[PDB]
Swiss-Prot record:
Effect on the protein of changing residue 164 to L: In strain: Gamma/P.1
Outcome of substituting residue 31 to A: In strain: Mu/B.1.621
Domain called Macro: residue spans: 1-167
Encoding gene (name): rep
Name of protein: Papain-like protease nsp3
Function: Responsible for the cleavages located at the N-terminus of the replicase polyprotein. Participates together with nsp4 in the assembly of virally-induced cytoplasmic double-membrane vesicles necessary for viral replication. Antagonizes innate immune induction of type I interferon by blocking the phosphorylation, dimerization and subsequent nuclear translocation of host IRF3. Also prevents host NF-kappa-B signaling. In addition, PL-PRO possesses a deubiquitinating/deISGylating activity and processes both 'Lys-48'- and 'Lys-63'-linked polyubiquitin chains from cellular substrates.
Subcellular compartments: Host endoplasmic reticulum membrane
Activity regulation description: Inhibited in vitro by GRL-0617.
Self-association state and partner proteins as the record states: May form homohexamers. Interacts with N protein.
Topological category with respect to the lipid bilayer: Multi-pass membrane protein
Complete-protein stretch covered: 1025 to 1191 of 7096
UniProt catalytic activity: Thiol-dependent hydrolysis of ester, thioester, amide, peptide and isopeptide bonds formed by the C-terminal Gly of ubiquitin (a 76-residue protein attached to proteins as an intracellular targeting signal)
Amino acid sequence: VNSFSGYLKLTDNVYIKNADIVEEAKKVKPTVVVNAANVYLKHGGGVAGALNKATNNAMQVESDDYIATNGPLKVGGSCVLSGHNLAKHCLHVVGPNVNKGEDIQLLKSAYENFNQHEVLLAPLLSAGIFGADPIHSLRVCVDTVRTNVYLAVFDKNLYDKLVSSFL
Ligand SMILES: Cc1cc(S(=O)(=O)Nc2cnc3[nH]ccc3c2)n(C2CCCC2)n1
C-alpha cells in the first residue's frame, strides 16, 4: 500500500490521474518524481519549468552543476538528482522532442529508465511541448515500464481522451 490517491488503474502496474504533477508531488512526497528533461537540464517550460519553479530554482542550480561536471545527457537517457521540496529524488528523463526532429523510437529507451525505480510519479514522456502524441506515449509506457508508475496528466480534456481510448 502507498499514498497515491484517486488514480484510475490501467494495468497491473500503471495508474493515471488528472492532476498537476507539481501539486501531486507536494502532497505525496514520492520517493521519485520524474522530470520531462532535455539533455542540457535547462528547465525552462512545460513540466520541467513547472517543477523547477516549485523548487525556487534550486533544481536548476543543482542541474547546472551536474552538467558542468558530466556534460549533457543522451536523448533516451536519465540522471538521478535531488527531489528538493517535491520528492526524495528527481529522475530527469530525456524523451525525444519531436519539435527538434528526434527519433520517436527513443521513447521506449526513455521509459526504460523508469524500471530502475520501484515506484514513480511521472508525466507522459515526450508529451506536451515535446510534441509527441500522448496516446502513443501512454502505449509505450504501458508496454515498457514494469515498475509501478503513477501518471499525472495536467489537461483534463487530454486525461479523458487518454482514458477513453486506452486499449
Ligand atoms: C506545458 C504543460 C503541459 C502539461 S500536462 O500535464 O497537462 N500535459 C499536456 C500535454 N498535452 C497538452 N495539449 C494541450 C494541453 C496539454 C497538456 N503541463 C502540466 C501543468 C501542470 C504541470 C505540468 N504543463
